[PDB]
Amino acid sequence: EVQLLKEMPKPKAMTIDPSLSQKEATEMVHAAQRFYAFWDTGKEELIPQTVTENFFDHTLPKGRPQGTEGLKFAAQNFRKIVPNIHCEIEDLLVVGDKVTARLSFTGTHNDKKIDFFAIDILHVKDGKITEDWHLEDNLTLKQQLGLIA
Amino acid sequence: EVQLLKEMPKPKAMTIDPSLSQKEATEMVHAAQRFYAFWDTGKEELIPQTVTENFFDHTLPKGRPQGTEGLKFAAQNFRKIVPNIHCEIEDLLVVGDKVTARLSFTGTHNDKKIDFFAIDILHVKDGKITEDWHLEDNLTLKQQLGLIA
Numbered sequence: 337e338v339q340l341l342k343e344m345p346k347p348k349a350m351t352i353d354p355s356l357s358q359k360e361a362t363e364m365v366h367a368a369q370r371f372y373a374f375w376d377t378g379k380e381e382l383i384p385q386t387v388t389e390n391f392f393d394h395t396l397p398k399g400r401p402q403g404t405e406g407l408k409f410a411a412q413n414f415r416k417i418v419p420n421i422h423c424e425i426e427d428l429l430v431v432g433d434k435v436t437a438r439l440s441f442t443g444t445h446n447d448k449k450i451d452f453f454a455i456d457i458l459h460v461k462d463g464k465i466t467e468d469w470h471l472e473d474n475l476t477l478k479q480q481l482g483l484i485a
Numbered sequence: 486e487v488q489l490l491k492e493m494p495k496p497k498a499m500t501i502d503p504s505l506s507q508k509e510a511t512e513m514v515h516a517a518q519r520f521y522a523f524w525d526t527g528k529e530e531l532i533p534q535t536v537t538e539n540f541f542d543h544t545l546p547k548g549r550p551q552g553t554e555g556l557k558f559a560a561q562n563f564r565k566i567v568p569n570i571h572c573e574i575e576d577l578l579v580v581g582d583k584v585t586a587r588l589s590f591t592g593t594h595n596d597k598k599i600d601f602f603a604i605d606i607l608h609v610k611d612g613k614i615t616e617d618w619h620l621e622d623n624l625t626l627k628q629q630l631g632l633i634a
Contacts, residue, residue, distance in 0.1 A: 353504070353580055355502070355503040355504055427583075429580055429585060431579065431580035436583075436606060438606055438618055453618075455606065455619075455620050456604075457585060469602075471603070474623075474624040475627070484633065
C-alpha cells in the first residue's frame with residue numbers, strides 16, 4: 337500500500353490502480369494530499385510543491401486568474417468568506433496519470449454554517465499536478481452564504 | 486481495448502485500469518455509455534439496462550426524487566425549459582469498481598448558447614450502476630438561462 341503523508345488530509349475511501357509501482361502510486365496520492373492540504377490551510381508554499389509552473393485549470397471560475405496565481409487568489413478568497421474553511425477527501429480514485437477526488441468543505445460565514453461538496457479530476461505527471469477540471473456546488477454555497485434563494 | 490457501443494455517446498478520452506479484464510472494463514464503459522445515452526435522449530427503456538432497481542443518488546439535486554423515478558423526472562423536467570440539449574462524454578476514468586465521467590452539455594435556449602459541464606462518480610457492480618455522486622455546473626447554466634446575474 338501507499339504510506340500517506342501525515343498531517344495532510346487522509347482519504348476516507350480510496351481506490352488505486354494496482355499496476356502502478358509503489359513509487360508512482362505514492363507520488364500520485366501525495367500530490368492529491370498536498371493539493372487538499374493547500375485548500376484546507378491556504379499555505380501558499382505548498383503550490384510549487386504540488387502543481388507545475390504551467391498548471392492549467394480547464395474549468396476556471398469567472399474572475400479567477402489562470403495558473404498558479406489563481407490558486408493563491410482562490411484560497412485567500414475562500415478564506416475571506418469562510419475564515420475557518422476545512423477540506424476533507426471523501427474518496428480518491430487513482431488510475432494511469434489521473435486522480436479523481438470527491439471533497440467536503442465545511443465552516444462558518446459569520447452567523448451561517450457552510451457545507452458543500454466538490455469533485456475534481458487531476459492530471460498528474462511526475463508527482464505534480466499539471467492540469468485540472470473541477471466543480472464546487474456553487475449554487476448550494478451561494479444559498480448558504482445568503483446571496484441567492 | 487474496449488469495444489464501444491455504437492449509437493451512444495463515445496468517450497473522447499479514457500483511462501482504464503490495466504488490471505481489469507477486458508470483460509470487466511467493457512461492462513463498466515458500456516454502463517457509462519448507456520447512462521449518458523439516457524441523459525442525451527430521455528429513453529426510459531435504458532434505465533433498467535443501466536442502473537440497479539435500488540439505484541441511489543448520494544448528491545440529489547433539490548427537487549429531484551430519489552432513485553430510478555428521479556432519473557425519469559429529471560430528463561423530462563429539464564426538457565421543459567431546454568429541449569434542445571445534447572450530452573457528450575469528455576473523459577472516462579475506470580478503476581476498481583468506480584467510473585468517473587466528465588460531461589459536456591450543449592444546446593440553446595432562446596437565442597442563446599447553452600454550454601456547461603458536469604462530473605459524475607459512478608459505482609458499478611456486475612455491469613450496472615448502483616449509486617452515484619455527481620455535480621452539474623448549475624450556476625453557469627442559470628446564468629446562461631438569464632435566471633442568475
